[PDB]
Design a protein around this ligand. Structure first.
Ligand SMILES: [K+]
Ligand SMILES: [K+]
Ligand SMILES: [K+]
Ligand SMILES: [K+]
Ligand SMILES: [Mg+2]
Ligand SMILES: [Mg+2]
Ligand SMILES: [Mg+2]
Ligand SMILES: [Mg+2]
Ligand SMILES: [Mg+2]
Ligand SMILES: [Mg+2]
Ligand SMILES: [Mg+2]
Ligand SMILES: [Mg+2]
Ligand SMILES: [Mg+2]
Ligand SMILES: [Mg+2]
Ligand SMILES: [Mg+2]
Ligand SMILES: [Mg+2]
Ligand SMILES: [Mg+2]
Ligand SMILES: [Mg+2]
Ligand SMILES: [Mg+2]
Ligand SMILES: [Mg+2]
Lengths: 191, 86, 208, 117, 137
RNA sequence: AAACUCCAGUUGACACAAAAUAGACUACGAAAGUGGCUUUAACAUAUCUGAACACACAAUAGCUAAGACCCAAACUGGGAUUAGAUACCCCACUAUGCUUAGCCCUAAACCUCAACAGUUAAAUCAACAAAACUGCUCGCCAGAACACUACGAGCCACAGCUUAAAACUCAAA
C-alpha cells in the first residue's frame, strides 16, 4: 500500500520537485534544501505523485494532511474500486471419486459467486490410463452445474508436456448474463 | 491515577549518566517482579496454565537452591590434591 | 602444503635485521634468538628486498592475472603506471604555475589514493534471524575493504561497455577518475553505502 | 533457605492435595547444565547511525564525514578485538564462577546417593 | 551531600536545582513504548504540550516503526522541537516495554536535552481487564 | 493487508468487570472449590464402616426470564496464507463469561492411589510410578471390540443425562 503521510526528513531521491502548501509550484530542488524549507516554514512533506520521473512532493500542515486523507476515504467508501481478481487453483485427478468431485464443485461455485478466476488442472490418475478426451469431460461436468453462472475464461489446453489439461473459469459478465436470461426466456416462450 | 506522581518507579540521574539510571530502574522493576508480570500479562494465561507454570517455577527454585547449596559446600574441596602420587 | 607446520614464513625486511641490539626490547631479543632455531620457508618468487617493491601493486597485479599469466599481468600493470604518469606530465606542462602545485605526477601516489577513495566503509552481509536471512549493514574489516576496492576497479575495466580500448588505457583512466572522487567505481561505493543506509532499520538483526 | 518440601508432593499419608507436580524427581543430579551462550546483538550501531546520518546530510560524500567515518571504524576495531578478548576469558573462566567441566569433576567426587548401600 | 536516587518530595525544602528550577517545575517527556510504535510527548510542568513525535510521524511504516533506530529518530525530532521552546532538562516518564523504550531516551539526549530522572509508568492492573487469548505459533 | 481516523498523546472526572505484590506461604472446605477490604452469621458427629432403593451438593459449558456491559470471546463477517484453509495469523462483533430467579447434573470431577485402625520386621520388591505391608468394612472389576451404543425405566432434562446389554467379529487387545 501507499499511504498519504509525512515522508519525513529523509527523502529517497536527491532531486525533488516541490510544491507549496497553497499549491504554488516551487520547482525542482535538492533534498537538503527541502529539509531547510520544512524547518523554516514548520511544515511536513508529503508525496503527491510518484509516477512522474521528477519526484513530486508537496509541503503541507498536519491539519491539511488529515483533510486530504479524509477526502480520499470518502471517495473510496462512496465509489469503491473493484479489487484485483484473485486466482484460485485446483488440481484434480482423472479417477477422482464422485463424492470428492461434488465437494470441489461446490467449492468452485463459491469462488465464482465471489467473482474469482478458477484455474482447474486435471492430471492422469495414479496407475490409470486415460485419454485427453475423457479428462476434458470433467470440465464440462463441473461447468454443467453452473449453467448461467460460469463460463470458460480459457478453454481446456494440454500442458505439462501433455500429461494434464488446464482451463480457467470465470463469472459471466452482466452483458453475458442478460443474454443467457434472454435466450432462456425465448425458449420458454417457444415452449 | 489517584496517587502522587514522580514517586513510584522513579530514579534520579547522576552526573548526566542516564545509562546507569536506566539500568538501576530496570534492575528495580526486575527484582520486584514487574517486568516478568508485564510480559505474562500481554496474553491471558489460563488458570490451569498459570498453576502449571508456578509449580514448575517453584520446583526449579528448590532444585536450583539445593544444587547451589551443594556447590558451595563442596567448593572448599577444589583445592590441590594433597596426596598426589598415592 | 609440502611444508611441515614447523616451517615459519620468511621475514624479508633489511631494516629489521640492521636494527642495533641496544634498541631491542627483552621481548624482541627473545624473538630473534628463537628464529635461529626455527625452520624458515623459502622466499616466494614474487616479493624481494627491492626498494621499488610495493605489496599493493603486486596484489592488484595478481587479481588481474588470468590463468597464471603473470608476465602479461605485470606488463599491463607497468603499462598502466606509465600511462598514468604520461597523462599527468601532459596535464602538468599545459597548466599554470599555480595549478601545477596541485597536480600529482607520481603514479604510485595516484594508484594508492585512487583505491583508498573506493574502499567501502560499511558492508552488507546476509544474517539469519528467526529462520530468515536478512541483508544487514555491517562493519567491514580492513582486509575486506581493500579487496573490494581492487575487485571493483578490475571488474569495471573488464566490463564489455568499453569497446576495443586496451586495459592500460581503461585502467589508467579509471584510476585518475577515482583519484578525483569520480567515475563508476566511486558510484558503486555510494550505492553500497546507500543500500546500507536504506537497511539501517535492519541493523538489529546482526548478532555480533 | 530452600523452600520447604514437607507435604508438597502427592504421597501416601499426605492428606492435602499436592502443592507441586514435578515432571522430574526432585533429586540432585551429579552434573550441572552447560554454559548457555548469550544471544548475540548488534554493536556499534550508535556510531554506525552517526556516520550514516552525515552521509544523508552530505550527499554520501565521505570528504565531509571523515571524523564520523573514522569513529565508526574505531568502534568496530575495538569491538572486533572484544570478540577475541571475551572468548579468551570465557574459556579461561576469568569471569565465570567456575567452569561446568570444573564444577562437574568436583561433583563426580561427591555423587548424590539416592539409594542405600 | 551524598547522592539520592529518590526524587525530591514536593513541599519539602530541597537544595537541588536545574537552571534555577525545582524538580516540580521541570518539563516532562512522556514516552509510550508500544510493541509496534513509539510515541513521545514533551509537556510542561503545567501540562502544556511542547512537542510531539512518533515513529509514524517520522516517516517509518509498519514493522520498521517497531525498532530501536526508529524510536531514536522520533526522540531526536521531539527534542528539536522542544529545545526551540526553551527546554533543556526533562523528566522522562516511560510506559511500555517496546523496543523504543530506551532508544527513545537516547534520541532525546542526542537532541540536546538533559534527562534528570527516569520514571516507569507501565500500566500493571492489580487483578483489571482480561487480555486477549494466547497465540498458537 | 483489512480496520479506525468525532483518531492518538497529556491531564481531570469516572464500573453491576477482574481481584499485582504478599504466596520461596501450604492454609480452609465433604468434594466441587476458595488468595482485594470490612462486618454479621458460621465451619456436623465424645467408637468406626455404611444408602446406585434415598437426601443434600457438585468446575466449565448449556437452557429459561429480567438486567448490567469495561474487557475477553464460540459463531459469523472481513484481511492474509495455501493446491485448497470451512483452520493455524490479523481486525470487527454476537451468544457466553457477570448479577438476580429457576433449571441442567456433566469433567483427565485424576493427587486415576476408598474409609477407619496399625506396622516398618520378616520374603523389601514383576516393571514403571508416589517404598512394602497388616486388620476391618463398603464400593467396584472378570479378553478385546461392538459400547460414554440399542431397548427398557427414571428425570423441570426433548439433538439431554443416569443405569446399560445382546447378535455378528477377532486371537488377540
Ligand atoms: K488484588
Ligand atoms: K503468586
Ligand atoms: K465421572
Ligand atoms: K490428574
Ligand atoms: Mg495462490
Ligand atoms: Mg510425568
Ligand atoms: Mg458414616
Ligand atoms: Mg453445576
Ligand atoms: Mg450461566
Ligand atoms: Mg473486544
Ligand atoms: Mg456480550
Ligand atoms: Mg464481580
Ligand atoms: Mg479438579
Ligand atoms: Mg475415578
Ligand atoms: Mg467409603
Ligand atoms: Mg492409615
Ligand atoms: Mg469385557
Ligand atoms: Mg459422556
Ligand atoms: Mg445414551
Ligand atoms: Mg431411550
Amino acid at each position: 500500500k501507499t499511504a498519504f503521510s509525512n515522508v519525513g526528513r529523509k527523502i529517497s531521491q536527491r532531486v525533488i520537485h516541490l510544491f507549496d502548501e497553497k499549491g504554488n509550484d516551487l520547482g525542482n530542488m535538492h533534498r537538503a534544501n527541502v529539509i531547510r524549507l520544512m524547518d523554516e516554514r514548520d511544515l511536513r512533506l508529503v508525496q503527491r505523485n510518484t509516477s512522474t520521473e521528477p519526484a513530486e512532493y508537496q509541503l503541507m500542515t498536519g491539519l491539511q494532511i488529515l483533510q486530504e486523507r479524509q477526502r480520499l476515504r470518502e471517495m473510496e467508501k462512496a465509489n469503491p474500486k473493484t479489487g484485483p481478481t484473485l486466482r484460485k487453483e485446483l488440481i484434480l485427478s482423472s479417477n477422482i471419486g464422485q463424492h470428492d468431485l461434488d465437494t470441489k464443485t461446490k467449492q468452485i461455485q463459491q469462488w465464482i459467486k465471489k467473482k474469482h478466476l478458477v484455474q482447474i488442472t486435471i492430471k492422469k490418475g495414479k496407475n490409470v490410463d486415460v485419454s485427453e478426451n475423457e479428462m476434458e469431460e470433467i470440465f464440462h461436468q463441473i461447468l454443467q452445474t453452473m449453467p448461467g453462472i460460469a463460463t470458460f475464461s480459457s478453454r481446456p489446453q494440454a500442458v505439462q508436456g501433455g500429461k494434464a489439461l488446464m482451463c480457467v473459469l470465470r463469472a459471466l459478465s452482466k452483458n453475458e448474463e442478460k443474454a443467457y436470461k434472454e435466450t432462456q426466456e425465448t425458449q420458454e416462450r417457444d415452449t | 491515577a489517584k496517587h502522587l506522581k514522580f514517586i513510584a518507579r522513579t530514579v534520579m540521574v547522576q552526573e548526566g549518566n542516564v545509562e546507569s539510571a536506566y539500568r538501576t530502574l530496570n534492575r528495580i522493576l526486575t527484582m520486584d517482579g514487574l517486568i516478568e508480570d508485564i510480559k505474562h500479562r500481554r496474553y491471558y494465561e489460563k488458570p490451569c496454565r498459570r498453576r502449571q507454570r508456578e509449580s514448575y517455577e517453584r520446583c526449579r527454585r528448590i532444585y536450583n537452591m539445593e544444587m547451589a547449596r551443594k556447590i558451595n559446600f563442596l567448593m572448599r574441596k577444589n583445592r590441590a590434591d594433597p596426596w598426589q602420587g598415592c | 602444503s609440502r611444508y611441515s607446520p614447523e616451517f615459519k614464513d620468511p621475514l624479508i625486511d633489511k631494516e629489521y635485521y640492521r636494527k642495533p641490539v641496544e634498541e631491542l626490547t627483552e621481548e624482541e631479543k627473545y624473538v630473534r634468538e628463537l628464529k635461529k632455531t626455527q625452520l624458515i620457508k623459502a622466499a616466494p618468487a614474487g616479493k624481494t628486498s627491492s626498494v621499488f617493491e610495493d605489496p599493493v601493486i603486486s596484489k592488484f597485479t595478481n587479481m588481474m592475472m588470468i590463468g597464471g599469466n603473470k608476465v602479461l599481468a605485470r606488463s599491463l600493470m607497468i603499462q598502466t603506471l606509465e600511462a598514468v604518469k604520461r597523462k599527468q606530465f601532459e596535464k602538468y606542462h599545459a597548466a599554470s604555475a599555480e595549478e601545477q602545485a596541485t597536480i600529482e605526477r607520481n603514479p604510485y601516489t595516484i594508484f594508492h589514493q585512487a583505491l583508498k577513495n573506493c574502499e567501502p566503509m560499511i558492508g552488507l552481509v546476509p544474517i539469519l534471524k528467526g529462520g530468515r536471512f536478512y541483508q544487514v549493514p555491517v562493519p567491514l574489516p580492513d582486509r575486506r575493504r581493500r579487496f573490494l576496492a581492487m575487485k571493483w576497479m578490475i571488474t569495471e575495466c573488464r566490463d564489455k561497455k568499453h569497446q576495443r580500448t586496451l586495459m592500460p588505457e581503461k585502467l589508467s583512466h579509471k584510476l585518475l577518475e577515482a583519484f578525483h572522487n569520480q567515475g563508476p567505481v566511486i558510484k558503486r561505493k555510494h550505492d553500497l553505502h546507500k543500500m546500507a543506509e536504506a537497511n539501517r532499520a535492519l541493523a538489529h538483526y546482526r548478532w555480533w | 533457605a530452600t523452600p520447604s518440601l514437607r507435604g508438597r508432593l502427592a504421597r501416601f499419608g499426605n492428606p492435602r492435595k499436592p502443592v507441586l507436580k514435578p515432571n522430574k524427581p526432585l533429586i540432585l543430579a551429579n552434573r550441572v547444565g552447560e554454559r548457555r551462550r548469550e544471544k548475540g546483538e548488534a554493536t556499534c550501531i550508535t556510531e554506525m547511525s552517526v556516520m550514516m546520518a552525515c552521509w544523508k546530510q552530505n550527499e554520501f560524500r565521505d570528504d565531509a564525514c571523515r571524523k564520523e567515518i573514522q569513529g565508526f571504524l574505531d568502534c568496530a576495531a575495538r569491538a572486533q578485538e572484544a570478540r577475541k578478548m571475551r572468548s579468551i576469558q570465557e574459556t579461561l573462566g576469568e569471569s565465570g564462577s567456575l567452569l561446568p567441566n570444573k564444577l562437574n569433576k568436583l561433583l563426580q567426587r561427591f555423587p548424590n546417593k539416592p539409594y542405600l548401600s | 551531600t551524598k547522592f539520592s536516587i529518590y526524587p525530591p518530595i514536593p513541599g519539602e525544602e530541597s537544595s537541588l536545582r536545574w537552571a534555577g528550577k525545582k524538580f516540580e517545575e521541570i518539563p516532562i517527556a512522556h514516552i509510550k513504548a508500544s510493541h509496534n510504535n513509539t510515541q513521545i510527548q514533551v509537556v510542561s510542568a503545567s501540562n502544556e504540550p511542547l512537542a510531539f513525535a512518533s515513529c509514524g510521524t517520522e516517516g517509518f511504516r509498519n514493522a520498521k516503526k517497531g525498532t530501536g533506530i526508529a524510536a531514536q529518530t522520533a526522540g531526536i525530532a521531539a527534542a528539536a522541537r522542544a529545545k526551540q521552546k526553551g527546554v533543556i532538562h526533562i523528566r522522562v516518564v516511560v510506559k511500555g516495554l517496546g523496543p523504543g523504550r530506551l532508544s527513545a531516551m537516547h534520541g532525546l539526549i542526542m537532541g540536546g536535552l538533559e534527562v534528570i530522572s527516569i520514571t516507569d509508568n507501565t500500566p500493571i492492573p492489580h487483578x483489571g481487564c482480561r487480555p486477549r487469548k494466547a497465540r498458537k505459533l
